[PDB]
Design a protein around this ligand. Structure first.
Ligand SMILES: [Zn+2]
Ligand SMILES: [Zn+2]
Length: 575
């Protein structure tokens, strides 16, 4: 406890020895409270609207899903209400039999994941290349690595001085990246290496993967959401995730054990809180849960979700009974036999990206196999704890990574599998600019990035292809898209290029598409298919409405208004 986190609290206390106090009425119930100090508020209750795509998407000014997405709250008040919901809770300790099967499955899973790859340290040169107090992009060119070296020497002694978490210091995240970044950089959770994973595959491939899973004989496809996954990571999960250190070299194992013991299994967090005296940052700590702003959070969530779904498949097939989960002397024989004879096959029945999961069990007993899932702490969201799960018998209805996927028939007979989501979520996100003082050019370039992402991923939506062509017609051709649209893991960002969208389309969907055997290229957007009109409307299309027809037939007027305000540059007509 204080032996691991004491030095961190001391340095925070001495750096703010002025304005240091113990608020006797702190609102923390499951976190250990230490102290507080005052700082200026950070964040905002609303976000800036991207005027370029807003002016080109007038019918969606009157849409509630779009209007809501401009009111996110990152203020210290918003910081505190999200803390009450699920962060300030305790997850009950799993039963002794459940803890054994988790430990057996975790070790078997780590051996399988490391059958070809060996763990390795990540480097300052890697961290510096990936970025392309607190820190920005003046810091890697600064010799701030002397700070990193001094903290690493503390980690080599099993101590920690300045690795805290903010609901970050770049030095602590490098040290974490140095010891655990190999999971992401070496793609341990690619589908080839992990069977269930989808890391590096990309949003344009997830639908094909779900379609391949549907070919496996079995029951329905299940995709249960977990209520607050990061808050349900137990001390047993962290101990099971730590077993990867057994495959490391001694110098790597030492730095990773330091990350696990001093940064994951013990954590110091500074959180902002409103008070009748201003804005106050509090210093709390706990021994479980997972920090969301961490490298390897995705990989360790993926690993633990893989293990948990494997265990639920065990219970569905009758390998695990209630008596087994209660038994502190549970035998390993039938658990080990099942994993070594069926484990890889059962892993192939799943698509798992962090807490998002899709599994196709061998039959539908899985739907009512809930003893281990609930006892492990991964309680499903918005459903009675023991009510059976509802699965889908059509992979196209299965939700995964905030998407569903449609199989489309091109006019030449070839088949595409495209990602899709309710259209208001796509338009509402595109109308949101990130930050404060950005010029019209940077605002238009971000809108161009969303337009080209729609041309690559959501071309099959009539409203989006029209809006994408209007945005690209209103933004100068030579302007390069800035920032990122998705901020997500599955985004390969093939739309950031200024290559012809139809050329990039042919590369993504034909040339590089492993599920497309006919490499015959598409020569015109007219040969790029849409969703069925019924499906398009089911997923939020405004086609058929007169406000959409008026907007479509008068779209060049809105494009010219944006061009008039942008200035005298080179434009192209894409309509
Ligand atoms: Zn540290
Ligand atoms: Zn759809």
């Amino acid at each position: 406890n204080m032996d691991v986190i004491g030095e961190r609290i001391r340095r925070i206390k001495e750096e703010h020895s002025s304005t240091w106090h113990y608020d006797d009425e702190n609102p923390y119930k499951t976190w250990a409270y230490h102290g507080s100090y005052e700082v200026k508020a950070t964040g905002s209750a609303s976000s800036m609207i991207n005027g370029v795509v807003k002016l080109l998407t007038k019918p969606w000014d009157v849409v509630p899903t779009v209007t809501q997405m401009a009111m996110t709250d990152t203020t210290p008040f918003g910081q505190q209400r999200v803390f009450k919901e699920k962060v300030d809770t305790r997850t009950p300790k799993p039963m002794p039999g459940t803890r054994k099967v988790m430990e057996i499955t975790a070790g078997w899973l780590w051996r399988t994941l490391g059958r070809n790859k060996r763990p390795r340290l990540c480097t300052r040169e890697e961290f510096t290349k990936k970025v392309r107090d607190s820190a920005r992009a003046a810091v890697e060119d600064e010799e701030f690595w002397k700070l990193v070296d001094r903290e690493r020497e503390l980690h080599k002694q099993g101590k920690c001085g300045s690795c805290v978490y903010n609901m970050m210091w770049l030095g602590a995240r490098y040290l974490e990246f140095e010891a655990l970044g190999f999971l992401n950089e070496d793609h341990w959770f690619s589908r080839e290496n992990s069977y269930s994973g989808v890391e590096g595959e990309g949003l344009h491939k997830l639908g094909y993967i779900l379609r391949d899973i549907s070919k496996i004989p079995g029951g329905a496809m299940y995709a249960d959401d977990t209520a607050g996954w990061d808050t349900r990571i137990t001390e047993d999960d962290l101990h099971n995730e730590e077993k990867i250190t057994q495959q490391m070299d001694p110098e790597h194992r030492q730095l990773a054990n330091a990350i696990f013991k001093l940064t994951y299994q013990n954590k110091v967090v500074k959180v902002q809180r409103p008070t009748p005296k201003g804005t106050v940052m509090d210093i709390i700590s706990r021994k479980d849960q997972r920090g969301s702003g961490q490298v390897g959070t995705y990989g360790l969530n993926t690993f633990t979700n893989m293990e948990a779904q494997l265990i639920r498949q065990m219970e569905g097939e009758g390998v695990l009974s209630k008596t087994d989960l209660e038994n502190p002397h549970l035998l390993e024989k039938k658990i080990t036999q099942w994993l070594e004879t069926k484990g890889v096959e059962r892993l192939k029945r799943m698509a798992i990206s962090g807490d998002d999961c899709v599994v196709k069990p061998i039959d539908d007993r899985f739907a009512n196999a809930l003893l281990a899932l609930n006892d492990m702490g991964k309680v499903r969201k918005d459903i009675p704890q023991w009510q059976p799960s509802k699965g889908w018998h059509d992979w196209q209805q299965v939700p995964f990574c905030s998407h569903h996927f449609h199989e489309l028939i091109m006019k030449d007979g070839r088949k595409l599998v495209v990602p899709c989501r309710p259209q208001d979520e796509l338009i509402g996100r595109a109308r949101i600019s990130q930050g404060a003082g950005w010029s019209l050019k940077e605002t238009a370039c971000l809108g161009k990035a969303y337009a080209q992402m729609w041309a690559l991923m959501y071309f099959h939506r009539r409203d989006l292809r029209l809006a994408s062509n209007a945005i690209c017609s209103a933004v100068p051709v030579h302007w390069v898209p800035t920032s990122r649209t998705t901020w997500s893991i599955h985004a390969h960002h093939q739309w950031m290029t200024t290559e012809d969208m139809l050329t990039v389309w042919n590369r993504v969907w034909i040339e590089d598409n492993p599920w497309m055997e006919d490499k015959t290229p598409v020569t015109t957007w007219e040969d790029v298919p849409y969703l069925g009109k019924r499906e398009d409307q089911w997923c939020g299309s405004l086609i058929g409405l007169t406000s959409r027809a008026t907007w479509a037939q008068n779209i060049l007027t809105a494009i010219q208004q944006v061009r008039s305000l942008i200035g005298n540059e080179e434009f192209l007509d894409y309509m």
